[PDB]
Symmetry: D3
Subunit: 256 residues, 6 copies
């Protein structure tokens, strides 16, 4: 049972800022353990390449790959490619990665390979959903607990269970609607709710989840490493639709 | 001096959720007493008809009639029994009649899950915590109302245990209006800015409970301890039928 | 419905410090109303004699006599008018007489700066926040008292706006005792442990105000909203002379 | 993934009061899950015998043993005795893992303010404690002797740092164990424990359960630490059934 | 070292409401001292002329100038105009130090909810703001053009980090200045300021003073930042005396 | 206007933990500025000697010397010498250093030269008096504000003004009574209060000031440097009366 030195990110005590030297000297297990209760780890000034990034992330579990799989599709390059959604340049609204049985994701790793001309756009943001669900007005929590949420990729509709109870956390899976004007790769709905009701629900929940007690915004710089426990937080990418911006991240996903 | 089991609704400890059996076994006076300090009572899964509803509420005092039990069924063409917003108000200060307790029972609710809420505001805690420039206006300025379906409405009436609030907010743009407020010496710009800013203060989750209705819900409010609002439900598919009762003592 | 200017005493917003001029210009009913939600009023630098004191307090209701104005002058040999502790209690539940407002005026205070406080406790906020095992006892167990200078004293009497508390703490070891409490089904060990732990809860600064007396101080308490205590002042050099008035309505 | 209805015990939101009907209708896994984040579960008005108690608890994992412990207040004994059991978690003096502890009240008479089982939210307390208290817990070696071996204070399970600690018995209470901290004098160790204990007993972190017939207390042993307060009055009947499980 | 009696303005304990008699009886140094930790002083019901106002303020230090500014709501002007003055501290566009600002109300008619002078507790706000907002304030270069030069956001005085910042004017309000942040696009700078402004306007950090005849507002210019809300209704008389001092 | 990296010590945001490398690279002025609002600075693993300690502290102002002065009595060695009070082994109760006109002290520096056999005794403790005075029951604050406090060194009695208003802080000077059994070098009294009242006042104020929101306890190790802004905090030494303990600190005092 080893200890890493860290500082909290949130005023509530959530999140972990870790010095690069303390991170690199830490055992994989010490950070994986810390992620469970801190939700996310932020390390700056780590100058590595994609292979080293791969050696760091692959130690945390079985690589979840981004006509089936042979372990080759490991590192996803999110480089802001025109005409794409996930690897594109617009918003990716509140979601958690992966899916449910073998497609489950426990840890997500995002490394900044190259960031230029961007200072206040394109953040990866992170939400402490368990503290948020514990504190939200019961009228918001009741919908998340009792209603059937369905998603369509843009009878195309399928159910996404909002809460999967792992004991230590209720793992959250949800897919917020992309804001108007943003290229959408998915679309949510709530069974028995109208479009008006669903739209208003998501807007009010989104506003609640983005209050600074639960919300962390990460503005990217070269060398940043953002690791998330995918069952403990949900996340979002803010838009970066300016052609002068260079924003290249490497993405890794693991599970046990 | 009996005790009813309850759980608080708000995080501040205000509000009371009471189980339907506990509610029915409790004496009228036990619930009536709890209402004064908790402001509102929420009972779910209570299966009663309109006659039983009358028998429950009429025990709380003298029935304040309208011109017995009001049927708010969402009629196309009306205001109070219409399908739109009824903004922040307290009951009985327009057609000047003392109202102490307000009762709302859901007879039938269909096709509505995130519209048509009855909302409730803890005004005493909000007045205690609000910025001085907001409270200043409420305490010092003359507030007047005109019916639209000009007279002075005293904002605070000190009953000791609470400063009973009587106020009538402006209806949101596009909602059919039953009243219209004004503040003496304030321009229209100023009054509108005032009410928008105060309304946003009052709707913060520390003071504000939103009730989304289901068949068998009973909402009881102490009319001197809270103010309330109906949110719009202007979609023809919605069935929202509520029974309303109003009581007072002399 | 007039307003008196005031500043809160506690950090929670409870209590009311009122300037002596503001107090004298205010109507009786304005102070009487504020007392219900603030629990207590503190006025400093008020220069009145005993006749004027009577005229101020008698306006609040019907005088509850003792056997008019009580003179608590620290007499060697007595208890209530003695020089020792009077532990946490509310007024009028031993010699069963309703007391709504209690008034204490300092006629003369000399050689005392950190003894002989009258202390005041916000019981409603404390009951709302106390550990369940403490509140459990207060709500469910039978509390009894015996005069010593056995009968049931109902801990809570629900008046709606407050649960009026009637309780009589044990006197600290070495203080002359006017009463003695017991809890039915509790051993002496258990009761003593209970009261020590509850007393420490009630004395935390969030709920507890300690008043150190000065010439011209006036302390008014709403007897249903607070409980109070006198701390010992057993040093012969101390002059602590207070006038006491007690009022109630039916 | 079912939901049991519950109300929190602490103002922080920790603990779960669960109605007896709701408890009995819930899947084992639902409660077992809830315990991880809530720390402890309190059910009142349950009327079961020892066999049913066994059926309830054994479903949570492997029984740690000789299965049900009858803590009845037997004289001349320690754990099964009538005095204090100070702050601890179960299963670190024997070297056997305990995940869940279950306590049931089969008979309580003549006790209203004594013999409590108390529970402490150790993860919130560690996150909020003064740093000079935390430093000792994290960096010093704590040893225990059964009435000398190293017991690690924290074992990092990810979701919680499981606490294994054995507090000293108050004077006058018969000790079943005795702690020490390597490098500290007897003065220093006593002071450290007195100060830490008072921090742990603050109402934000501390629940006291006074027992009544039919109460069931379930604790997740990695998430909380616990204590038994003395009940050395001979008129008291305090008879509890005890069950322990782990994976 | 005298004491003036006061009541705090904010729930945090910042600000000082001081009765007019108590204000007039207090030594200058007592108020000047109080302002450092309280940020701002509010006195109501003071009936003075411009000469007495000058006597009061000039005693606090050297007058920064042409001594008293008559902000009367003159049309076709900016500072002395009728529209918004966004968040700023005084004296960084001219290069002259301002320690204390004094504002007195000589005539107010027909305005009850407009033309406020507002005050912001910047040190509490910086200590509590999201880190992505603070990082910009601490590490980026902010420039201003008077309607381009570097204005340092923080100047460390020890007891406070004095803030010099010039917010952008809302659209439709005549701009007396214009800000920029080096390395940020126009989109980014607008977003940063919109988000920061809303954080600064939260009631924990923000006092709004609606003016009445006889009000005196004194601000310590190193401890707070301030704003004037628009009053572009022609029926309004808003006439303030303004004084500024420094050491 | 430079910035040092630091972490708060208190949950309220008070105090500054500074990495040794960040401290040593910082300009004197940056730490002196920070002390004003953080009250105290804590640096660990600084391995210096008494001359270097002197070069560090003397840059902060004019050396306050511990038959008058010529600048030679600069560094005080508190080594737990038997039969002494200040440089002895018992408690030094709540006080601030120095006095009032030329004997005023602005910054105090305490460096640990040698610490052995002590893990939970002999702490230097630090109190955030301004937050404490702002939050205390008015009955405690009223005594500090309105009564005359006098001190005697053990018509030997002299007045100590509790509050000296510097604007940014009310500088506190107070001398708590030494606990029973501890060798006392001073004795307080309050004019018009009896011994009983004074004793009870100090006990209740002391309990209030020692609540963790205001109180920091420093357990010494080799290489620790504790710097205090003497106007912003008050402090205390807890007893270390065990003969096996080695506790040698170096002390420096400066003022402007
Ligand atoms: O680009 C980012 O900021 C993260 C993208 C993301 O959330 C994903 O690929 O699932
Ligand atoms: O329909 C509702 O939600 C409440 C209507 C109401 O407040 C009233 O009739 O007084
Ligand atoms: O003397 C006092 O401080 C109060 C005495 C008292 O509470 C009473 O007489 O009821
Ligand atoms: O008697 C109790 O309260 C249970 C005590 C306990 O923790 C044990 O026996 O392991
Ligand atoms: O008009 C005001 O409110 C004062 C505005 C101000 O800050 C200035 O003139 O420098
Ligand atoms: O020895 C210490 O811990 C500090 C001693 C001290 O406070 C002093 O010399 O004034
Ligand atoms: Fe993602
Ligand atoms: Fe209504
Ligand atoms: Fe009394
Ligand atoms: Fe145990
Ligand atoms: Fe200005
Ligand atoms: Fe010292």
């Amino acid at each position: 049972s080893e200890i890493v030195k860290f500082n909290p990110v949130m005023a509530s005590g959530f999140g972990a800022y870790i010095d690069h030297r303390d991170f690199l000297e830490a055992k994989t297990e010490t950070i994986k353990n810390l992620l469970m209760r801190q939700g996310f780890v932020v390390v700056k000034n780590l100058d590595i390449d994609s292979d080293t990034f791969r050696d760091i992330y692959s130690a945390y579990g079985t690589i979840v790959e981004y006509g089936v799989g042979f372990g080759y599709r490991d590192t996803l390059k999110l480089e802001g490619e025109k005409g794409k959604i996930v690897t594109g340049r617009g918003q990716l609204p509140f979601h958690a990665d992966g899916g449910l049985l073998l497609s489950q994701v426990d840890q997500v790793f995002l490394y900044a390979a190259e960031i230029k001309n961007v200072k206040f756009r394109g953040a990866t943001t992170v939400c402490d959903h368990a503290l948020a669900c514990q504190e939200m007005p019961a009228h918001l929590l009741r919908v998340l607990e009792e209603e059937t949420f369905e998603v369509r990729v843009l009878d195309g509709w399928f159910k996404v269970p909002v809460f999967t109870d792992l004991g230590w956390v209720r793992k959250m899976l949800i897919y917020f609607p992309f804001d108007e004007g943003q290229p959408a790769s998915w679309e949510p709905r709530i069974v028995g709710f109208t479009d008006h009701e669903t739209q208003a629900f998501f807007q009010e929940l989104g506003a609640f989840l983005k209050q600074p007690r639960y919300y962390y915004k990460h503005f990217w710089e070269d060398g940043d490493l953002l690791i998330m426990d995918n069952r403990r937080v949900i996340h979002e990418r803010e838009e970066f639709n300016d052609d002068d911006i260079v924003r290249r991240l490497y993405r890794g996903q693991t599970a046990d």
